[PDB]
């Protein structure tokens, strides 16, 4: 569907409400696609107009072009909004497209974007995951990474809909983007240590809020209702799901966070 071009490539974007609205963007992880969002856009299509693109490489044409730095992805959104001419606009991202998201409210204003949400973005790293970055940029067994991650991602579900997803959007784009993926979300708790200390270093704070389901932490969870005791400019908000795309598998519930939050 709609594709504007931008920077070094193309993103394939879908487009959903009405143009003058409020403008909310929705972002996903490394090898995801904006049918991450095929639950969550229909409903937000109502208050906002929805954009989900598809980052480099990522479009229907899987088009290769030099590798690149998670700043550079940041690049092609940001030729994105001037493209277009969107002033006024949030955005929402998922997973490791969040380090993207935080870098442009980083480039941009906090003035110009007060607020912005995350989803699902691991805000500390821990052994396992060390691990299963490495597994993941093994040029013949990159797939046993990948599919490390995939069982830990699942749990235990039923649900149709994240079953799908990791078994026909994700493992369906090339090894060789599995491995850029680790190579970059690799590189980025190397800089920042993690996404509590990337937050933490900006000069200006918006309000942020995490959606999250996932690890299934008990620790974790507690971890961020101090974080947030301690910084006001933080608001977890843990859907009660065992899976970690909460947009596929509890879109009703993070419609109405996104909803709420963002006004």
């Known amino acids: 569907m709609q594709s504007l071009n931008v920077n ?119 052994p396992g995951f060390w691990q299963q970055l490495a597994e993941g940029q093994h040029p013949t067994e990159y797939v046993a990474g990948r599919q490390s991650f995939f069982d830990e991602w699942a749990e235990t579900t039923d649900n149709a809909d994240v079953l799908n997803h990791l078994r026909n959007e994700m493992p369906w784009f090339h090894g060789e983007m599995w491995q850029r993926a680790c190579r970059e979300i690799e590189a980025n708790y190397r800089t920042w240590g993690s996404p509590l200390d990337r937050m933490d270093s900006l000069p200006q704070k918006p309000e942020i809020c995490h959606i999250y389901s996932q690890p299934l932490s008990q620790d974790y969870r507690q971890l961020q209702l101090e974080f947030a005791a301690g910084h006001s400019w933080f608001h977890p908000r843990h859907i009660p799901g065992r899976t970690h795309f909460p947009s596929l598998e509890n879109p009703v519930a993070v419609a109405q966070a996104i909803r709420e939050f963002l006004q």
């Open 8 to 126: 070094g490539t193309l993103m394939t974007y879908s487009e959903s409400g009405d143009p003058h609205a409020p403008t909310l963007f929705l972002l996903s992880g490394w090898c995801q696609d904006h049918r991450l969002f095929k639950n969550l856009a229909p409903l937000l299509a109502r208050d906002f107009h929805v954009i989900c693109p598809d980052w480099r490489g990522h479009d229907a044409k899987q088009t290769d072009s030099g590798d690149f730095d998670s700043q550079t992805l940041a690049q092609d959104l940001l030729a994105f909004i001037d493209a277009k001419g969107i002033r006024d606009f949030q955005m929402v991202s998922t997973s490791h497209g969040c380090w993207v998201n935080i870098d442009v409210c980083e480039q941009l204003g906090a003035a110009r974007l007060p607020k912005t949400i995350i989803i699902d973005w691991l805000l500390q790293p821990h």
